[PDB]
Paper text:
The A2HBD has elevated expression in F. prausnitzii A2-165 and is crucial for the transformation of acetoacetyl-CoA to 3-hydroxybutyryl-CoA in the butyrate cycle. The monomeric structure of A2HBD consists of two domains, N-terminal and C-terminal, with cofactor binding occurring at the N-terminal domain, while the C-terminal domain facilitates dimerization. The A2HBD protein exists as a hexamer in solution.
To ascertain the binding mode of NAD+, we determined the 2.55Å resolution crystal structure of A2HBD in complex with NAD+ cofactor. In the structural analysis of the NAD+ complex derived from crystallography within the P21 space group, it was observed that all subunits comprising the hexameric assembly were found to bind to NAD+. By superposing the NAD-bound form of A2HBD with the apo-enzyme, we observed that the monomer structure of the NAD complex is similar to the apo-enzyme structure, displaying a root-mean-square deviation of 0.543Å. Like other NAD-dependent dehydrogenase enzymes, the NAD+ cofactor binds to the Rossmann fold domain without forming significant interactions with the C-terminal domain. Observing the binding mode of the NAD cofactor, adenine moiety of NAD cofactor is somewhat exposed to the surface of the enzyme, and the ribose and nicotinamide portion fitted into the deep cleft facing the acetyl group of the substrate. The phosphate moiety of the NAD cofactor resides within the G-x-G-x-x-G motif, composed of Gly7-Ala8-Gly9-Thr10-Met11-Gly12, situated between the initial β strand and the first α a helix within the Rossmann fold domain. The NAD cofactor is captured by the enzyme’s Thr10 and Met11 main-chain nitrogen atoms, establishing hydrogen bonds with the hydroxyl group of the phosphate moiety. Hydrogen bonding interactions involving Asp31, Glu90, Lys95, Asn115, and Ser117, along with hydrophobic interactions with Met11 and Phe138, contribute to the stabilization of the NAD cofactor’s two ribose rings and nicotinamide moiety. The hydrophobic pit accommodates the adenine moiety, fostering interactions with hydrophobic residues such as Ile6, Ile32, Ala88, Phe,89, Val94, and Thr98; thus contributing to the stabilization of the adenine phosphate. When comparing the catalytic triad′s conformational changes from the open to closed conformations, it becomes evident that in the NAD+ complex, characterized by an open conformation, the catalytic triad resides within a hydrogen bonding distance from each other, thereby contributing to the stabilization of these critical residues.
Numbering used by the authors:
A (entry chain D), B (entry chain C), C (entry chain A), D (entry chain B), E (entry chain E), F (entry chain F): 1 to 289
Write the structure that this text describes.
């Protein structure tokens, strides 16, 4: 009911879908400007009718979700609608600038969670009139079932359990984690991608060989270079850079190959080229040749 | 072709099975003592008709397979083989002595391959005449389809691809690796386990929560703390120390909590207690609770 | 001699008292506004009125010390001063703005000194027409006998000696420091407290355990965690980051637990909460239980 | 109760005094040879007569304290003892074989404790039939009030509790320390001295300056360089090496200046030259001038 | 060939001379306005005549190289160019916008190039209509023969080879560099200078000794401490910090002594004082006595 | 003056040549066995068929150099030597024993010098009746004109000044060094080669391009990879390890490529294969093609 999704990108669309999938949620997909928001809802819709083509979901529910999602600026969001899940740029200032009113133009009745993957939950919510909590999704947010619950330094446990019940009543498994850089999943998962980059940069193996070896030798559903393309390399570099800045530990130095690629605009799937090139045939070719 | 397997342990049997399921590839499964190569051999037979008993093999092959493997010790079986996949104690001097002995035994066109994980392939065959290559199987070597081919500093390109051709001929998917500590799999997988222990020691979450987070948010079949008990925490601590000694990079410094548990005999599954207590009724209780 | 103390705060007051406590030393206590300056003086007087009523100083000298301190702002009273000791905000351009403005106001023979602890003496006085030196007092400056004489890159040895002589002229012991981060005391004392936070965060011991251990085993007047809240965790955090940034050495990486508390506004005694909760009944409870 | 003190050295003598100081406590002071155990008792009795002649302890109690300590060998005396504190050479295999001996001579209900400060108490007692705990006394043990209770990986919470009861009973303050290198005091105090050496090596300040800065700017009873000369630079270097090897963290790297002095035999007070030259005139002169 | 050299500073003048030293070459020397753009040509002409005065080039060629250069503004002169080489302020946003203009002023087949020492070629050319490549010159650019060719993340192999051909066509030896921090020379040379400062700061050897040790022990033409002053200590400090920030590796931490000198304006030859005081008599004197 | 050079290897012969080519210098080239002492003199006199068959020197003085070097072993020749220069195996245990009896054999006014590049001068001369000082030559000692005078902990400055006196007498340039790992040249030069290896391993540039870039870009007479092969990659790897284990800083970690090549016996010029393949035709070829 009146769920607030700020950010209409890779995962704002997934959280919008994950909430609008169930009974009634009437979800609010907002972005920087109006057309970028409906561009994200259009991608949600084209996916939904590409998924009735293969008959994995009926046609009536596909638009019941798309019609429950209202695109736009924060002008449908900020009528004190409900619990709000920010999915904006992985940058401390932008995550706290927007939250300067998502507590305010909403009634302080509401719950203000952030889907940040490494940032400090406490510093995001440093001056708002009500707690800021962390609800952490994983892409695709409609398929994956884990929700990382992160309590702020002085965030009351009232907010933490009311959001644990929200995820339970959506088919998700809530697990509470104490606030630290990259919490639990990303602090373990992202350096795996960072290490595969180092392995390729230092000529240990090729791109396809790194991803095959992690899939057959460790039974992983996707290799780390594949996984970095799916997440988005700009996000991967931002998470690695937060871990380094917070800890001061060179254990988390981002591999220079990834920063070179992110500077080149090759962020993976969302840009059409990562460690692999994404051809129109829905096929995937390693950049190594 | 005839293949020797120096060592009849977990990897000695596993590799022998992978070399027995196809054709007139006769394996000489050796060990230090004949009492044990048959012990080894006896263990493989039991697991076969553990599964002949389950309508999934015909025993006409589960017998032609076990008949192809002949047990003994190196000198009285290994004069007429074309490939030696040694899998012995992970010690630099036992493998150097071994290949120093088999060099004066085997055919002068028999290929010498090592199944080591943490030792330098180049240093193994430094005193030998014929090239030494890396052939890294994965537990269990019968069904695991990945083989890391390790090219040493002086491993000719010819030797590498013949191992790559033997690997495809036995259904395995090979990958070429230029010698570096932890090649690909263990260089990514083991620091992942190491980072999970840092999560626990720093109190970011509990043992169960870390494991469940990694199978629900990253789709991993086993949790990292789970896997560390399976592989063996002594094996993981040794690999982290190899990566740290080889590179000098404090990025691969082993977690002090893991070093504490190894000195306590709590090596995981093979000792009854690891990160989880392995009770008699098979319940897996985290030592945290 | 006449001395101009720029800044009428905690250290400006203590430095004004340290100089006027002598005899031929008169002080010019300056601040942002005049009312903010004679504010600082009014508190210096109230202190000396209490020290009189306890029988630990006569009234006639408490009168004489206060009579030697004249409030106001600079430009009006710092033209004849022989020594300038700034006690302004820990901000580079603030001290640069201030020292450049006094460069025209003070007579050529006026020595310029700064009280900073984390800012580079050499950089503060870059464009100044005269040398700049460091005079590091320790709170409370009127009773603490140590003064660090910080020599800059272009601080002439003679300027160093004139600070040495004035320091002995007021009963203090001057210790010369060649400009480095954390000079001598902070570079040793703050990584001490920083180590205590790492010990607590990694579950080595409890808060009450660490502090009483450091005062019983090392005979220290205060535990490090206690001392952290007393100096202010924001101050200790900024010092570690200055150490880390200047040297680039991960040895001085700030403990994430301290950075978490500073984000939550828990800075210690000055906010009621720290490693200890400073209760209204003036007791002090470890936050561990 | 009866307390077997193993090792009649500096710490064993003080620990024997710290126990025989209480009324109902009997001490067995053992060593390698019987005569060596009696020489240690002769020295504590000598220090007691020097205390009676100075009127700080009546002659009645010194004779009672001395009569509670009986020297000898491991088997003859330690059979019927309730607690065992070992104070032997800081050698992993020395302490390992000693506790294995007592595991067959000491009664089952006897408690096994070690005075080690650099070795892993988990590893010390890995093969014993009973738990091991750490009881880290402080020199001089007869008047130092701290006791560090070291809980290993398999030290039960019950054993930690009874060690704290005995410590409170003999007038000491227990502090539970979960096993980590340098526990609490040494992990904080030794890097402090190590930092002071770095400050001198980099020419920040001279020797006497650093020490007087720490006693006047931090209210410490002794300067860090002074403290190292009193502890012994060989031990301070050994501690830093343990911290560096157990963590793998460049943060705990020893100052090369210290290692150069240790190689030169300038270990401080016990050699007559450290950071200070210790003349026969009871004076102390820094190497700097 | 027509070459547009954007930036009339120290390297812009030399790079313009390296191209006009050859014969079918026209050079446009651009700046922000036109006066200082013609000034840059005036500094060149004055440098050129002092060579004809000593007898090192005839007036026939000195004037002819001057005539091949045209000062002015970018739009007026660069629409008909075949190569662009920017030598502007080492600032990422500045270089990003000038190539945005040139992307629509220059003809389709014109080749862009950047002389940057410390900024990512990939990022400079993120959204251009044509590839961006690095052409690193070395000061003095008209006689030094090395030209580092930097391949960005998206720089085609063809455009790099065209730059290679342009290098030999003007008398230079090109070397291909896949973009990394410091490319090749600065990544090796600057940490060499940095290490010399570390050797000095820690009291290993004197300034005069370190230099003579490197020129006589390694047969270098200059010592590392005098080379740093020749380059400029601010330049060297900026290279070490870009290396440190790009790699996140503490291996490239800048020597605090170099940082202190830059803050004090002791930048080397260009300021008359570095590790050596460059004298009236044009002879150098170490600051070490 | 008469000198005793202990050792007949490359540096033993080289220091013997460097001394015997002045005039009043007589050398006692002592080794472990006489026959190998005449070995060194033979290689000296064999190579000296390239100074008179080249006729630079007249055999009036071209055998007065080979006549000044007298073979034999230690105890029979060094009873009255003016200076001792050991060049034995780079092993701490061997050198102390060597100087241990030279102490009793040589006259009291004999100066003890050592040529070690990695071992600690202070530790070698700990238990001696006279100070030991470092005299570090550079291969080839006859042509290289630098001498690193290494002052140990207990080495007097007076003893340093006479090593400087002797160095000028033989035409060399002494530089005083205070004992530190890798002194000055190796601390700067070997990390150069180490960084060049990292550049190759990380795919930044090829072996040939890296070398010409350092020759043409920094005016170095040799490339850094070239110099590693010339110095010997085993000695280069040993220095980095010595630099790493002494400082404890991961700044000095050895490149894994170098460690790989050393394990493969590809040490450079003295084995025929390094970073270049050294042809008998006196040319070389990079291993990159
Ligand atoms: N990429 C992942 O797999 C995932 C992992 C878990 C956490 N999330 C977190 O979600 C956040 C969003 O990143 P993403 O993965 O969706 O990639 P993304 O960059 O494509 O999505 C970001 C979206 O937010 C929009 N946006 C930016 N600023 C905004 C503002 N002020 N107001 C409204 N909208 C704004 C952007 O236009 C963009 O559409 C990240 O910060 C990340 O921490 C990332
Ligand atoms: N999952 C794993 O354990 C992992 C997987 C990849 C490869 N690695 C490597 O494979 C190799 C085999 O290890 P494992 O898992 O089988 O442990 P293991 O101890 O069970 O196997 C050792 C076997 O080799 C025998 N052996 C020892 N020395 C011998 C000798 N000199 N000659 C002949 N036989 C000898 C032993 O008797 C024993 O049977 C190891 O080097 C290991 O590093 C194992
Ligand atoms: N125990 C300590 O507080 C510690 C001790 C050593 C020195 N340091 C340094 O001493 C200096 C004094 O800090 P503080 O502890 O007194 O905090 P404070 O806030 O109490 O003192 C700051 C005072 O300086 C005034 N001020 C600001 N700008 C001014 C200006 N341009 N001209 C005149 N006055 C100005 C402010 O109005 C304020 O009253 C700081 O730089 C601090 O880093 C303080
Ligand atoms: N200031 C300190 O001395 C410091 C304080 C904290 C604890 N530590 C630890 O205390 C323990 C002892 O320190 P110390 O200074 O007294 O050593 P020490 O050299 O002064 O004397 C040790 C005594 O133990 C005896 N001993 C050795 N092995 C023995 C054995 N197998 N059986 C019986 N006796 C044996 C020795 O004969 C010797 O008398 C060490 O583990 C040390 O790390 C000492
Ligand atoms: N020896 C060296 O200094 C070193 C050598 C190799 C290359 N690097 C790189 O060369 C480049 C230039 O270095 P420099 O020595 O000339 O410093 P510089 O400051 O002297 O050059 C700046 C010149 O370029 C002009 N300029 C600035 N912005 C401009 C713009 N937007 N358009 C046109 N002109 C502009 C300025 O007016 C000025 O004349 C830098 O990127 C530097 O990193 C310099
Ligand atoms: N580029 C270099 O070679 C480098 C340069 C500076 C000095 N260093 C140091 O110079 C010393 C000599 O180096 P090297 O290359 O000539 O070694 P080497 O391998 O050439 O042989 C060492 C020589 O010393 C002899 N020797 C060994 N032990 C002896 C002993 N106990 N008594 C007498 N003679 C003994 C040996 O017989 C042999 O002749 C080493 O310590 C080395 O680290 C060498």
């Amino acid at each position: 009911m009146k769920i607030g999704v700020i950010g209409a990108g890779t995962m704002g669309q997934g959280i919008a879908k994950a909430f609008a999938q169930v009974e009634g949620n009437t979800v609010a997909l907002c972005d920087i400007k109006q057309e970028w928001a409906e561009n994200g809802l259009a991608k949600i819709k084209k996916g939904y009718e590409k998924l009735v083509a293969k008959g994995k979901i009926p046609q009536e529910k596909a638009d019941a979700i798309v019609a429950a999602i209202t695109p736009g600026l924060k002008e449908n969001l900020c009528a004190d609608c409900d619990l709000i899940v920010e999915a904006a740029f992985e940058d401390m200032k932008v995550k706290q600038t927007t939250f300067g009113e998502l507590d305010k133009i909403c009634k302080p009745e509401c719950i203000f969670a952030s889907n940040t993957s490494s940032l400090s939950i406490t510093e995001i919510g440093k001056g708002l009139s009500r707690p800021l909590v962390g609800m952490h999704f994983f892409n695709p947010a409609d398929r994956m079932k884990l929700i990382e619950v992160i309590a702020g330094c002085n965030t009351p446990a009232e907010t933490v359990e009311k959001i644990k019940e929200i995820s339970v009543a959506i088919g998700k498994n809530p697990v509470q984690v104490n606030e630290a850089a990259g919490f639990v999943v990303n602090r373990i998962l992202i350096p795996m991608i960072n290490e595969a980059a180092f392995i390729k940069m230092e000529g240990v193996s090729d791109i396809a060989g790194i991803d095959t070896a992690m899939k057959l030798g460790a039974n992983h559903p996707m290799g780390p270079l594949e996984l970095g393309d799916f997440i988005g390399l700009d996000i991967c570099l931002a998470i690695m850079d937060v871990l380094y800045h917070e800890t001061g530990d060179s254990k988390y130095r981002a591999c220079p190959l990834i920063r070179k690629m992110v500077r080149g605009g090759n962020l993976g799937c969302k840009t059409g080229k990562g460690f692999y090139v994404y051809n129109a045939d829905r096929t995937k070719t390693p950049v190594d040749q």
